[PDB]
Design a protein around this ligand. Structure first.
Ligand SMILES: *[C@@H]1O[C@H](CO)[C@@H](O)[C@H](O)[C@H]1NC(C)=O
Ligand SMILES: *[C@@H]1O[C@H](CO)[C@@H](O)[C@H](O)[C@H]1NC(C)=O
Lengths: 48, 48
């Protein structure tokens, strides 16, 4: 069953979606979402 | 001069101010889902 969520999609060089993450699943996914990236460097990050 | 005074005086210097963070989705919208959407167009400004 689908739910209303925000998700981040990564498009490759060819335009296909690979390796999406679900924001507001865990706070690590949330700071991935707010960084617009799938690599998170070491440190402290404020979330909502 | 034939004498002297040993003077101790204070100098007050500010060093740090209060650190703060802002949740935009909490400030701009109270808990409105209708306001949480249409705020997605302004997410870059809040990350800034
Ligand atoms: C894009 O497509 C080309 C041609 O099929 C392929 O060689 C290449 O590996 C693809 N790039 C990806 C999957 O990142
Ligand atoms: C210097 O001043 C102090 C404090 O008033 C005093 O006790 C002392 O006798 C003075 N010294 C001289 C050489 O006048």
């Amino acid at each position: 069953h689908l739910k209303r969520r925000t998700m981040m999609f990564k498009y490759d060089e060819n335009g296909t979606i690979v390796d999406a993450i679900d924001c507001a699943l865990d706070p690590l996914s949330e700071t991935k979402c707010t960084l617009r990236s799938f690599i998170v460097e070491k440190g402290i990050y404020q979330t909502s | 001069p034939t004498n002297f005074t040993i003077s101790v005086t204070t100098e007050v210097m500010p060093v740090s101010m209060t650190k703060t963070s802002v949740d935009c989705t909490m400030y701009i919208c109270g808990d409105s889902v209708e306001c949480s959407t249409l705020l997605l167009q302004y997410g870059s400004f809040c990350t800034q």
